[PDB]
Amino acid sequence: ALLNIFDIAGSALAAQSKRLNVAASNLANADSVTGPDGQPYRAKQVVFQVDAAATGGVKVASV
Amino acid sequence: QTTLPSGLQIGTGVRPVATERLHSQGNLSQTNNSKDVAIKGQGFFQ
Secondary structure, eight states: OOHHHHHHHHHHHHHHHHHHHHHHHHHHTTOOOOOOOOOOOOOOOOOOEEEOOOOOEEEEEOO | OOOOOOOOOOOOOOOOOOOOOOOOOOEEEEEOOSSSOOOOOSOOOO
């Protein structure tokens, strides 16, 4: 449509922002302990996937 | 169930309060003079 380029780029930007936020949160919680209800803190990562509408944007299903 | 109390309490610093003198009994040394006196126990001259 010559306009899905904006959608693809926006999805890429959102995914990169999510990944950066996760990394920053892990760095902040590097030396934390005993979070809520006492369970130890565990690090998290994100998984990128493509939206097969072929060629499509990137999404993050879950952390 | 059992977690840390999760409370914050920041200190401020340290100050000197007093200097106490150990009013113990010191040793006696002989000066051989005839007008020198030494206290055995408690008491102060005036």
